[PDB]
Design a protein around this ligand. Structure first.
Ligand code: JPZ
Length: 277
């Protein structure tokens, strides 16, 4: 393998994202002129707040991913104060940006992007990995407008944590337990948001959102594609063992065979040209 990279190998540019424990900065490697999104984490702050297990798990999960619809981890290094993770740069930003820009997706764009997300989840879940915080903010778009799912700090590897309120599955609120089917619940919220323009469970504060989620209190706009509504109803199901895609429903085959996806070719989505948004 190549000798470890270091900060001096790059010219750092603009900040791409900021979290409580990390900052992602666009960087151009001098020897190659390649651009990477470098996630930078301060060792002191991680240790102080007991985040070592999360940072360790994020790195370890990313190392295992080798699929076009996921962030790729190219390299890591550290200096005295900071860890550096070299990630694929998703030039077009967040799916959420496009939702806002255009309001809501037509049926062809909903179908295509939903199919990429389902195909990515099939790969992720086949590895026994659960994302636990899936949402349009961490579904990025590459230069070619294919998805690149990111943000694995909170993932779980199948042999505690609660993600973003609007996408939280009822079982987390009633058990503190997660599973693959929790990602599928989030998928149901995302589809709904692509079609309606907004997430299904909304309210003034988290407490009230949580109330709506555990009561399955949401509804569909009249202009909701009927087949997409049927799919969303089969995903937003309080009983986690009855969600389309979960093991107790015999997995991804029946999900991928849903009528909403009739015209989808599953085998080579990454090779297909995405519908203009
Ligand atoms: O461009 C990115 N690629 C991977 N992860 C990210 C996280 C935040 C902002 C950008 C990125």
């Amino acid at each position: 393998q190549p000798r470890k990279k270091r900060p001096e190998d790059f010219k750092f540019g603009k900040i791409l994202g900021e979290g409580s424990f990390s900052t992602v900065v666009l960087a151009r490697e001098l020897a190659t002129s390649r651009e990477y999104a470098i996630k930078i984490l301060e060792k002191r702050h991680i240790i102080k707040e007991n985040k070592v297990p999360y940072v360790t798990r994020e790195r370890d999960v990313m190392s295992r991913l080798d699929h076009p619809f996921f962030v790729k981890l190219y390299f890591t290094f550290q200096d005295d104060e900071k860890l550096y993770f070299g990630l694929s740069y998703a030039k077009n930003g967040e799916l959420l940006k496009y939702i806002r820009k255009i309001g809501s997706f037509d049926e062809t764009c909903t179908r295509f992007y939903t199919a990429e997300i389902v195909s990515a989840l099939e790969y992720l879940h086949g590895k026994g990995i659960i994302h636990r915080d899936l949402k349009p903010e961490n579904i990025l778009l590459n230069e070619d407008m294919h998805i690149q799912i990111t943000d694995f700090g909170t993932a779980k590897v199948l042999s505690s944590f609660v993600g973003t309120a609007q996408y939280v599955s009822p079982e987390l609120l009633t058990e503190k337990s997660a599973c693959k089917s929790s990602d599928l619940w989030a998928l149901g919220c995302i589809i709904y948001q692509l079609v309606a323009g907004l997430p299904p469970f909304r309210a003034g504060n988290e407490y009230l959102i949580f109330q709506k989620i555990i009561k399955l209190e949401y509804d569909f706009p009249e202009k909701f594609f009927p087949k997409a509504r049927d799919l969303v109803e089969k995903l937003l199901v309080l009983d986690a063992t009855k969600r389309l895609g979960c093991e107790e429903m015999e997995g991804y085959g029946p999900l991928k065979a849903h009528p909403f996806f009739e015209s989808v070719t599953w085998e080579n989505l990454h090779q297909q040209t995405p519908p203009k948004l």
